[PDB]
Amino acid sequence: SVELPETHQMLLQTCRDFAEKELFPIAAQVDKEHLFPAAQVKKMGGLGLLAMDVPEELGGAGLDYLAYAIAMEEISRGCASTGVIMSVNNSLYLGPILKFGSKEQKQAWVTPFTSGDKIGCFALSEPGNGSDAGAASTTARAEGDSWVLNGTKAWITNAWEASAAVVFASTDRALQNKGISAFLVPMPTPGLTLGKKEDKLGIRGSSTANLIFEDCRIPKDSILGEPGMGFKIAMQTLDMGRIGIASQALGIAQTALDCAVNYAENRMAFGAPLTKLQVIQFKLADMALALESARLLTWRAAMLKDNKKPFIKEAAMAKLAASEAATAISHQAIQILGGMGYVTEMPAERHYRDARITEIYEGTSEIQRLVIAGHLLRSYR
Amino acid sequence: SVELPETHQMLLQTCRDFAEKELFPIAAQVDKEHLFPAAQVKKMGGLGLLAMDVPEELGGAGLDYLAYAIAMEEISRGCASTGVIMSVNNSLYLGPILKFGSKEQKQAWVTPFTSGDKIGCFALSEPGNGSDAGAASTTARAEGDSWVLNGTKAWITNAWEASAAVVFASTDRALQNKGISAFLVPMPTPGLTLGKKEDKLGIRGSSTANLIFEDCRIPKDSILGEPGMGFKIAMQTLDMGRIGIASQALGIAQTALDCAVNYAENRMAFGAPLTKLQVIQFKLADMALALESARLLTWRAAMLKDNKKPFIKEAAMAKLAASEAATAISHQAIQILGGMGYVTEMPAERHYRDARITEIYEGTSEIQRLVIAGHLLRSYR
Amino acid sequence: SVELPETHQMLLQTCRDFAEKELFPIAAQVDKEHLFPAAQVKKMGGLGLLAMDVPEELGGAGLDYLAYAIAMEEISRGCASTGVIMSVNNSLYLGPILKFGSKEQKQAWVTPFTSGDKIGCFALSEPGNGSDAGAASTTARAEGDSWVLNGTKAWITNAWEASAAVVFASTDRALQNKGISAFLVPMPTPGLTLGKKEDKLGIRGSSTANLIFEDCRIPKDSILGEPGMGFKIAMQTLDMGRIGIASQALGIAQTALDCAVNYAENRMAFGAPLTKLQVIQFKLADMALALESARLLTWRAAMLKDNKKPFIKEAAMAKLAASEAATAISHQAIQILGGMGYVTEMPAERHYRDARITEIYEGTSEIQRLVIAGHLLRSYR
Amino acid sequence: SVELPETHQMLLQTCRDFAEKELFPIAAQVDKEHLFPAAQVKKMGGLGLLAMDVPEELGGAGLDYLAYAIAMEEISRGCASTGVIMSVNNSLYLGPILKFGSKEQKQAWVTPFTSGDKIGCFALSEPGNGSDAGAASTTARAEGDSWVLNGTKAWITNAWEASAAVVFASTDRALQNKGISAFLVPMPTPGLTLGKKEDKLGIRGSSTANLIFEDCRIPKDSILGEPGMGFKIAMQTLDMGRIGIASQALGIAQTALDCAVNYAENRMAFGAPLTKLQVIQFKLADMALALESARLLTWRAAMLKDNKKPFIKEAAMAKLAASEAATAISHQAIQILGGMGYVTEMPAERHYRDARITEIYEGTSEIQRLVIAGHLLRSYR
Ligand SMILES: Cc1cc2nc3c(=O)[nH]c(=O)nc-3n(C[C@H](O)[C@H](O)[C@H](O)COP(=O)(O)OP(=O)(O)OC[C@H]3O[C@@H](n4cnc5c(N)ncnc54)[C@H](O)[C@@H]3O)c2cc1C
Ligand SMILES: Cc1cc2nc3c(=O)[nH]c(=O)nc-3n(C[C@H](O)[C@H](O)[C@H](O)COP(=O)(O)OP(=O)(O)OC[C@H]3O[C@@H](n4cnc5c(N)ncnc54)[C@H](O)[C@@H]3O)c2cc1C
Ligand SMILES: Cc1cc2nc3c(=O)[nH]c(=O)nc-3n(C[C@H](O)[C@H](O)[C@H](O)COP(=O)(O)OP(=O)(O)OC[C@H]3O[C@@H](n4cnc5c(N)ncnc54)[C@H](O)[C@@H]3O)c2cc1C
Ligand SMILES: Cc1cc2nc3c(=O)[nH]c(=O)nc-3n(C[C@H](O)[C@H](O)[C@H](O)COP(=O)(O)OP(=O)(O)OC[C@H]3O[C@@H](n4cnc5c(N)ncnc54)[C@H](O)[C@@H]3O)c2cc1C
Ligand SMILES: CC(C)(COP(=O)(O)OP(=O)(O)OC[C@H]1O[C@@H](n2cnc3c(N)ncnc32)[C@H](O)[C@@H]1OP(=O)(O)O)[C@@H](O)C(=O)NCCC(=O)NCCS
Ligand SMILES: CC(C)(COP(=O)(O)OP(=O)(O)OC[C@H]1O[C@@H](n2cnc3c(N)ncnc32)[C@H](O)[C@@H]1OP(=O)(O)O)[C@@H](O)C(=O)NCCC(=O)NCCS
Ligand SMILES: CC(C)(COP(=O)(O)OP(=O)(O)OC[C@H]1O[C@@H](n2cnc3c(N)ncnc32)[C@H](O)[C@@H]1OP(=O)(O)O)[C@@H](O)C(=O)NCCC(=O)NCCS
Ligand SMILES: CC(C)(COP(=O)(O)OP(=O)(O)OC[C@H]1O[C@@H](n2cnc3c(N)ncnc32)[C@H](O)[C@@H]1OP(=O)(O)O)[C@@H](O)C(=O)NCCC(=O)NCCS
Numbered sequence A, B, C, D: 001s002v003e004l005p006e007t008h009q010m011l012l013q014t015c016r017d018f019a020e021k022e023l024f025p026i027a028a029q030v031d032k033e034h035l036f037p038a039a040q041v042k043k044m045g046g047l048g049l050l051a052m053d054v055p056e057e058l059g060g061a062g063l064d065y066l067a068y069a070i071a072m073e074e075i076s077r078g079c080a081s082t083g084v085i086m087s088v089n090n091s092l093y094l095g096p097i098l099k100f101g102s103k104e105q106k107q108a109w110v111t112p113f114t115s116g117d118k119i120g121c122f123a124l125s126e127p128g129n130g131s132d133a134g135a136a137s138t139t140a141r142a143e144g145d146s147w148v149l150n151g152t153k154a155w156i157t158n159a160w161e162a163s164a165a166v167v168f169a170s171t172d173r174a175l176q177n178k179g180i181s182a183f184l185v186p187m188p189t190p191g192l193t194l195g196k197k198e199d200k201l202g203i204r205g206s207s208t209a210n211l212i213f214e215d216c217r218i219p220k221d222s223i224l225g226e227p228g229m230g231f232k233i234a235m236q237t238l239d240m241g242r243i244g245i246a247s248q249a250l251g252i253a254q255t256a257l258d259c260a261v262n263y264a265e266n267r268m269a270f271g272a273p274l275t276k277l278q279v280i281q282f283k284l285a286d287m288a289l290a291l292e293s294a295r296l297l298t299w300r301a302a303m304l305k306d307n308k309k310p311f312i313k314e315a316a317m318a319k320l321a322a323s324e325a326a327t328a329i330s331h332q333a334i335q336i337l338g339g340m341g342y343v344t345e346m347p348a349e350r351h352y353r354d355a356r357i358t359e360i361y362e363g364t365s366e367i368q369r370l371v372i373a374g375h376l377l378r379s380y381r
Helices: A006-033 A038-047 A065-078 A080-100 A103-109 A230-266 A278-306 A312-337 A348-359 A365-380 B006-033 B038-047 B065-078 B080-100 B103-109 B230-266 B278-306 B312-337 B348-359 B365-380 C006-033 C038-047 C065-078 C080-100 C103-109 C230-266 C278-306 C312-337 C348-359 C365-380 D006-033 D038-047 D065-078 D080-100 D103-109 D230-266 D278-306 D312-337 D348-359 D365-380
Strands: A139-141 A146-152 A164-170 A180-186 A192-194 A211-219 B139-141 B146-152 B164-170 B180-186 B192-194 B211-219 C139-141 C146-152 C164-170 C180-186 C192-194 C211-219 D139-141 D146-152 D164-170 D180-186 D192-194 D211-219
Touching: A006 A038, A006 A065, A006 A080, A006 A348, A038 A080, A065 A080, A065 A230, A065 A278, A080 A103, A080 A164, A080 A180, A080 A230, A080 A348, A139 A164, A146 A164, A146 A180, A164 A211, A164 A230, A180 A211, A180 A230, A230 A278, A230 A312, A230 A348, A230 B365, A278 A312, A278 B278, A278 B312, A278 B365, A278 C278, A312 A348, A312 A365, A312 B278, A365 B230, A365 B278, B006 B038, B006 B065, B006 B080, B006 B348, B038 B080, B065 B080, B065 B230, B065 B278, B080 B103, B080 B164, B080 B180, B080 B230, B080 B348, B139 B164, B146 B164, B146 B180, B164 B211, B164 B230, B180 B211, B180 B230, B230 B278, B230 B312, B230 B348, B278 B312, B278 D278, B312 B348, B312 B365, C006 C038, C006 C065, C006 C080, C006 C348, C038 C080, C065 C080, C065 C230, C065 C278, C080 C103, C080 C164, C080 C180, C080 C230, C080 C348, C139 C164, C146 C164, C146 C180, C164 C211, C164 C230, C180 C211, C180 C230, C230 C278, C230 C312, C230 C348, C230 D365, C278 C312, C278 D278, C278 D312, C278 D365, C312 C348, C312 C365, C312 D278, C365 D230, C365 D278, D006 D038, D006 D065, D006 D080, D006 D348, D038 D080, D065 D080, D065 D230, D065 D278, D080 D103, D080 D164, D080 D180, D080 D230, D080 D348, D139 D164, D146 D164, D146 D180, D164 D211, D164 D230, D180 D211, D180 D230, D230 D278, D230 D312, D230 D348, D278 D312, D312 D348, D312 D365
Parallel strands: none
Antiparallel strands: A139 A146, A146 A211, A164 A180, A192 A211, B139 B146, B146 B211, B164 B180, B192 B211, C139 C146, C146 C211, C164 C180, C192 C211, D139 D146, D146 D211, D164 D180, D192 D211
């Protein structure tokens, strides 16, 4: 119900302790220097936080997706870039392989990646089409006994750190979505070149680059599932990723609210603490309401996924509400902090820049509203 | 969890069937003619919907407050005035008596009122002070063996139909809240006169009047609890009423959304259904999300109350979010219907006028935000 | 510039004096009883307020459109239904005849209507299509020497009081807009039947009905301009009407703000006036800014029209901003008044219901945003 | 009226030409490297853009404040940091000296600063109090024939480039505002030390530091006006600065809208340009409406100042509306650009970070709403 089980409570406490011990001292350094936190990722792999959905047989933690959402929220509260790296590795790489790959592919592509030594990446977007995922131009000709890949992916998270890749290329151009086919591409491999890192406004610990495939050949076993199923795999992986991104936005909004409340209590204006002003109280009330409401939606989406029931509309609602709430709460936290919120000495601006991204990737807000509207009208029809 | 138990599902189905059978044909007539639906209230008392929180020993249904929230949402979806009458009788009259009254008072003031033959009313507000509940000017002098009541209450719901009253009068003026004392006043009684009915913008089935007490004397047993506890009784009854009003606003928003979606699918513009337009889809998506989020907040508040845990901040959040969401959804439904939404032939304007009230009574939105802000700052401190 | 000329100032003062003398005592009676204010319309015709754009040669006042906007704002501040009647008679009937009709048609259809004895109506909308104005199904066969009209118009303002009608019927069905042709139809005439009055949520002084044409024949001179120009005539008349409706929404928002400020200063809560609370001050500040900004937009649109320059985007912006600001200000005024705002004794709910309409007729907000977007993209291209 | 005079049109064209020639190529470099654009400031001084309000006798341009607002909007459209430097030098330094200083002080402190070789700074805020300007703790003891200054100012714009300073120190502590006294402090002078530059989220061309006064002595003539008038001088200078900041926010919103519209027309999604989507059109319409509405308010405030009439409420409204509109438009521009808007290669994120500041300095939005509310209630009383 509303309360959490003992395992979930213990995981929440452990994640909060780890976050306050490790991520908070280094978050500013990671943001400023664009430094990939290798040691923190290794420690998270040691704690099993990178393989929560993975069964314990394959080396994972064997936990439900609600526990994953809680851990993602706590980690993103600690550090946003570490949060998005964890979210990518947990959902976007591990989920499709467990859900669709054969047992040999699971053994060869999940077990090394549970320990945290290696991480994965999700390669769907292209420079030509960002939202229209079905219009991917990457071609995968089945010449000989190998899949020859030609094309250029873009915006690939963890491109400079991943040891594997889930690449979606259209085997058949005529088939807009049917042609789409997934492939498990090891990194580094001949024929694959990594693009230059992109300077980003917000999350800067993670490395974002453009994968370029030039006559890249992979063995025939590297195809995920069967040809044609690529679009469905992409959609389901996107739903799970949307749940993860909603958790990340919740964490960002929570830490922004905590910093704002602490500063408002500490700061003195007109001979009184700022909390005595009614405007500040109303701002805090609205922020808390938005944050809690979103958290509820997220938890509902996670529990619906755990009960093996359809959750696409719920996940889209959770992602949209969490992203918008995080942006509004971060903006109001900057406004409450005032002048001190603008300088980089205080962490409010980092929360603002990190919260801005949650409305862009994993489907923009317009795409989320399209999904919600379609499912709503289908429900009434 | 997210799912509902079998009893709750059966109650939801029964309430929906009763609503579609009875309330929908007569809602327009009730709104237009200011007609109190006596037969519908009697049938609801027959179904036990007026005594859900009451134990079965005293003649109630013995159901949890979550079931009460579900039934309130369904009834308010059927008809808003019937919804507010049910909410008043269930929470604001029955709850304080069960929570604080002695067993003899329970037998003499709850058992006749479970059947639906008689209903109660909550008398707190005064013309002088609406939000400042602690500034009530009604005086209750303890002369002789009877409590002599002098004063004028205002805005009393069901004043023209109630057979009992929960009246709060300040026994001690010096004590702003300590002086406040509750009293169980039977109606009609000598010394009590009912004010004229007030024409209202929205809910017009219910009768709202001003109770006037002129030397009204009641026996000494009619006092609820002990003197001084009146303010706490009022606050707890207000929390339960806020949960009920949140359920009512949810019902209004739900029926407005249903009518808007049906009309949008039926209406043809520019050679296409209105749902083909992206603006309509985005409006429907935003409306859906709002309602669902509010519902979760409401259900969380109800479950927290059922588990015997503090729920004041949760109830305030649920009431605020539900009221604002209901107003926004009703306005957008009128906008979607366009010209046909403006005339009284279509039920959109009735939903608008009924949804406007949920931000005013049971504490305005500013008071709710004050409560949320106070509890938030207390949580951080 | 920002200041007003002496003629405009004198007209503003005269309109305000007339409004406070006449419209304010009878506004509640007009709203409640659906009473057409014949005497007030006659007095306005005596003051020349119904023929402001009309040259003095034809019996008008010969004033610029800025003066018309000011007078419309003041009258709608006095009474909303009188405001919409004045707006219809000034813009939607008189403007197209002066702009496109020949001199004989001006003499036979403008000079009697300047005095205020008779008023006109604008017949464009149909039950089939409300926003898609080009899809009108009314047919005008040119049989013999007369135009035979068949079809059914809908939502015609002043249908029960108009002595003339501007009816737009598609002469050629193949021509979606080219077929559209305007006609000056006298009322009453054989073959024309008036539909039943429609009960409306808001403005109820004006009479809204559905014109039904059954073999209605008019002389050949009654056609406005030449066939095919009907759509352009409709668009320009709509622009002028949008300016008028923006002025009306400004008046409604202004009177709502005045009542809210007066009540907030008078009402006492927590031992202080409501204006001492910071939340009330912030609400009043937001309301004020909105109204003033909208007024400027309106005044800019009116001055651009007076200088014989294109004003379509400006008029659309003014109408959209004025309507949204009026709705928000009326809602906040009801919220500020609290319980007393809900009853019909206070005039806040009347302002709410009257302000709701300004987002529906003369093009809904979505159509206004489409016009603004089209003109913006055309400006950049 | 709505149109601009020939001088204003010529100044607008010259400012736009200069902006597109100089500021646009170097804006990204200035933002990235925190580089003070010395050459651009010198060229602006050559064009007279730094001394617009200054009479031509003292070496200024002798232009009205409307021309200053237009030039500020164009320059801030070119580059935001250059815009805020120009705004500070024009209003916050030059205005108080011309308005209150004697002729000798004008000759010794305005004529060298019109040419653009030297610039000024406005020193009011302190680390202790940011919004409560009357609680400044800087002390100015009148020992001997010199004013000995002790205290620490904060957030001083152009602290590392100014050759003069307007410092406000409380001569009399007992007098909260009466004690406040202004002083013209040359820079550099013995006893004055410049604090370290502060890394800021947005505008980074300008240098922001903390002035520290330790036994700084100035001649007796350096006091501006007479003791006690400091608070009034600060308030009037703040009003003029609010007009300038509103112009800057207008420029930022305008360039963000231009970039967003151009990208939306260029980008192709789902086989169509983005402008074909109705959601994009509605976003563009809302952005254009907000921008134009604000621009109007700003121009009204500037013209009211030029006509020697009170403009405090108008300036506060203009600043608030311009800041909020700029933030909303920048956020929507980032959303429209999508993924490409997030990287630093595109200029959308720079517009976002620069537009965030306009709600903080020159009085936060809460202070603006307090000023508007006070003037509104004073108007009704
Ligand atoms: C880039 C930049 C440049 C600057 N340049 C200058 C300059 O040239 N000269 C100068 O003098 N200063 C300058 N400042 C400082 C400026 O005055 C302050 O940063 C800003 O105006 C508010 O200061 P604060 O945040 O410290 O106020 P705080 O009092 O610390 O603000 C706390 C919060 O409480 C709110 N608040 C406070 N009192 C009330 C109230 N009564 N009612 C409601 N809400 C309230 C505020 O709005 C704010 O959100 C600059 C600041 C920045 C960031
Ligand atoms: C009080 C009143 C007075 C009136 N007076 C007159 C009068 O004097 N003369 C006259 O001719 N008419 C009059 N009308 C009718 C008026 O034209 C319509 O009521 C109104 O303009 C819209 O009509 P509709 O709701 O039927 O349109 P509908 O097409 O039925 O509206 C459906 C909804 O879809 C939206 N929509 C439609 N097309 C699009 C699109 N392409 N993109 C986005 N959204 C879209 C609309 O905004 C609306 O929300 C009056 C109406 C009222 C209520
Ligand atoms: C349909 C209806 C039914 C009702 N039924 C009942 C009933 O059964 N029992 C009962 O006891 N009462 C009932 N009431 C009365 C109800 O308590 C009040 O109408 C409502 O809760 C607020 O009262 P008010 O508007 O008079 O408060 P006011 O104090 O007059 O409100 C003035 C405004 O100031 C705001 N305000 C006041 N204090 C503050 C503050 N400290 N901070 C910020 N904002 C503030 C309020 O939000 C409000 O907007 C009913 C009212 C209505 C309309
Ligand atoms: C930090 C970051 C990390 C990323 N990581 C990954 C990753 O790991 N894997 C991956 O595959 N991609 C990744 N991406 C790319 C991501 O898919 C896109 O950036 C984003 O989802 C949208 O792409 P776009 O802006 O290019 O779409 P565009 O089509 O260029 O967006 C244009 C605009 O139009 C809107 N729009 C488009 N179509 C419609 C429509 N039909 N209706 C309404 N509005 C519409 C969009 O919402 C958007 O506002 C990442 C991007 C970023 C910024
Ligand atoms: C555009 C978009 C919303 C929809 O895709 P489309 O190709 O444009 O439209 P479609 O017609 O393919 O959608 C419905 C089809 O897909 C399938 N599908 C769509 N959503 C699905 C879901 N959530 N689960 C399962 N199947 C789904 C349906 O089965 C249907 O095919 P059918 O006709 O055989 O039943 C999708 O590409 C998208 O989500 N874009 C944003 C996400 C993103 O970029 N994330 C970045 C990762 S960080
Ligand atoms: C104004 C208002 C919000 C708070 O009341 P106040 O008298 O103004 O302020 P107080 O200082 O009394 O509040 C705190 C006190 O009340 C008690 N209290 C407040 N809220 C409580 C709650 N939810 N549960 C229990 N006790 C509560 C606290 O114990 C404390 O007293 P203590 O110091 O002995 O601990 C309240 O009057 C109100 O809710 N008004 C709107 C509700 C309404 O009108 N409903 C209409 C019915 S349809
Ligand atoms: C739908 C709507 C917005 C546009 O009309 P459309 O027929 O759907 O679209 P169109 O292609 O006709 O629009 C452009 C055409 O009309 C003409 N036009 C459009 N707006 C115009 C304007 N403001 N001024 C002049 N001409 C205009 C253009 O010349 C063009 O024709 P061309 O190709 O020969 O140049 C219009 O019908 C409308 O305003 N509806 C809402 C208004 C309303 O109902 N008011 C009620 C009165 S109270
Ligand atoms: C807090 C604040 C809003 C008002 O100041 P206060 O000291 O708190 O309140 P006061 O009582 O002094 O306000 C009214 C007094 O000041 C004077 N005053 C206020 N605003 C004025 C104005 N716009 N023009 C002239 N005089 C003004 C009045 O004369 C009155 O004094 P009186 O009683 O002798 O008539 C002001 O300090 C402020 O604007 N802060 C934000 C601005 C800022 O920080 N800008 C940074 C520069 S980039």
